[PDB]
From Swiss-Prot:
Organism: Parengyodontium album
Annotated protein name in UniProt: Proteinase K
Domain Peptidase S8: residue ranges: 7-279
Cystine crosslinks: C34-C123, C178-C249
GO molecular function: metal ion binding; serine-type endopeptidase activity
Length: 279
């Protein structure tokens, strides 16, 4: 399949070269996979989700995305127009309040919830979790991601937006999950994108156009918006049977576009998410 005038980030993960505008992808589009978006929630009524999005857990007075961040990332995972896996199921876990903040205990509880709730769902092609959130280092937030990953969920986490080594950030620094950094439309590391040895892969993260609350669209920048690109790709590749949850991060790393990024610090991997789709 092909999406003309796709968001540049979509076009980038189907292209070896920057600056293209068409998103090429297998038509299976992540059907049969599930991606938990652990965030502010999802405006599941957004027409761009076509009923493929639903809230399954909130840790606040409402399950509504009164922020837009979670709807934005869910859009990059599986929205019709702005999404990588346009057929995947999206489940919303609202661990961030409508101001984008959230305590560690509640983010651990949401990760612990996904690891169980997945056994309640139909995801024959496997389960992915996109975590477009972060904070200071925590062994207990790290271990929760490791538990979610070990339970059989592909865990993609943002590296953080601190222009620093991600090893001081959580869940970013947890070794076993897929720590995702942000690139930009000219194949540079995003000015804010964290780096370091713990990073496994880079994704489009600067000026990402996706869904927003109120049925609108918005472009925002952040490693939080690169994560859903890799989550979506993970669901995509898992639906294709190319990988599994346990090895999806390694596979995306092996099949990435190597060495395409500028201002990648020494010791940080130079790998850009890439579906390697051949029409």
């Amino acid at each position: 399949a092909a999406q003309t005038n796709a968001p540049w980030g979509l076009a980038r993960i189907s292209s070896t070269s920057p600056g293209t505008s068409t998103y090429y992808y297998d038509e299976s589009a992540g059907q049969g996979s599930c991606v938990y978006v652990i965030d502010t929630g999802i405006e599941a009524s957004h027409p761009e989700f076509e009923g493929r999005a639903q809230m399954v857990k909130t840790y606040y007075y409402s399950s509504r995305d009164g922020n837009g961040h979670g709807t934005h990332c869910a859009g990059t995972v599986g929205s019709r127009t702005y999404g990588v896996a346009k057929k995947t199921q999206l489940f919303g876990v609202k661990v961030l309040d409508d101001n984008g903040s959230g305590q560690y205990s509640t983010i651990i509880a949401g990760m612990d919830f996904v690891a169980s709730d997945k056994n309640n769902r139909n995801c024959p092609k496997g389960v992915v979790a996109s975590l477009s959130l972060g904070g200071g280092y925590s062994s207990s937030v790290n271990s929760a991601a490791a538990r979610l990953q070990s339970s059989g969920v592909m865990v993609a986490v943002a590296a953080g937006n601190n222009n620093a080594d991600a090893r001081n950030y959580s869940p970013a620094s947890e070794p076993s999950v897929c720590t995702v950094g942000a690139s930009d439309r000219y194949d540079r590391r995003s000015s804010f994108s964290n780096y370091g040895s713990v990073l496994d892969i880079f994704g489009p993260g600067t000026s990402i156009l996706s869904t927003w609350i109120g049925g609108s669209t918005r472009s925002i920048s952040g490693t939080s918006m690169a994560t859903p690109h890799v989550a979506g790709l993970a669901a995509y590749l898992m639906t294709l049977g190319k990988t599994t949850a346990a090895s999806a991060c390694r596979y995306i790393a092996d099949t990435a576009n190597k060495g395409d990024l500028s201002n990648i610090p020494f010791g940080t991997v130079n790998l850009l998410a890439y579906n390697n789709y051949q029409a």
